[PDB]
């Protein structure tokens, strides 16, 4: 019963429709992103890796309503524990596997941060998070293979917080793009 995009281009077109209004049906977006069968012939132009850290590669600016990007995780690469600046966040596997670790939010007190959930995102699976769900950290499960994920944020945001797992203290972080529309950035 779910609308199945046949290409990454179909998916983008559907997303433009589902985010045209004021109401976002989270479960419907998630199902449609999941239904798209990752095809590396369609997204290899965005798959630009770096040796030391994961890269963020803008695919579509979603008419200001959302950002759609591809994240490329080298061998062993992982993220910090971060929030999502009051946005919706969808992340779909395109290649390999990510481990998502969900954390509880810290208090004012300093303390080791608490894990609320731990899972591996399967092939083509679409996960969802926002700040009310919790914080998370995401990482390539593999030290011999890369991972590639498709992320949708609505509204778009260019800053978030990184969290120290030992204390819960946080720092503001400005996120950058490694490339946009297949073109490397400065
Ligand atoms: Fe995230």
Swiss-Prot record:
Pfam family membership, one: CDO_I
Consequence of changing residue 153 to F: Almost total loss of enzyme activity and iron incorporation. Reduces zinc incorporation by 20%
Induction of the gene: In hepatoblastoma Hep-G2 cells, down-regulated by phorbol 12-myristate 13-acetate (PMA).
Needed co-factor(s): Fe(2+); Ni(2+); Zn(2+)
Superkingdom of origin: Eukaryota
Reported impact of residue 160 to S: Reduces enzyme activity by 20%. Little effect on iron incorporation. No effect on zinc incorporation
Sites where the protein binds Fe cation: 82, 84, 136
BP GO terms, sorted: cysteine metabolic process; inflammatory response; L-cysteine catabolic process; lactation; response to amino acid; response to azide; response to cAMP; response to ethanol
UniProt cofactor note: Binds 1 Fe(2+) cation per subunit. Zn(2+) can be used to a much lesser extent. Ni(2+) can be used to a lesser extent.
Encoding gene (name): CDO1
An example molecular function term from Gene Ontology annotations: cysteine dioxygenase activity
Signal peptide: none
Tissue distribution of the protein: Highly expressed in liver and placenta. Low expression in heart, brain and pancreas. Also detected in hepatoblastoma Hep-G2 cells.
SUPFAM superfamilies, per database record: RmlC-like cupins
The protein's enzyme class: oxidoreductase
Post-translational modification: The thioether cross-link between Cys-89 and Tyr-153 plays a structural role through stabilizing the Fe(2+) ion, and prevents the production of highly damaging free hydroxyl radicals by holding the oxygen radical via hydroxyl hydrogen.
Role noted for this protein: Catalyzes the oxidation of cysteine to cysteine sulfinic acid with addition of molecular dioxygen.
Originating organism: Homo sapiens (Human)
Pathway: Organosulfur biosynthesis; taurine biosynthesis; hypotaurine from L-cysteine: step 1/2
Name under which the protein is recorded: Cysteine dioxygenase type 1
Record's GO cellular component terms: cytosol
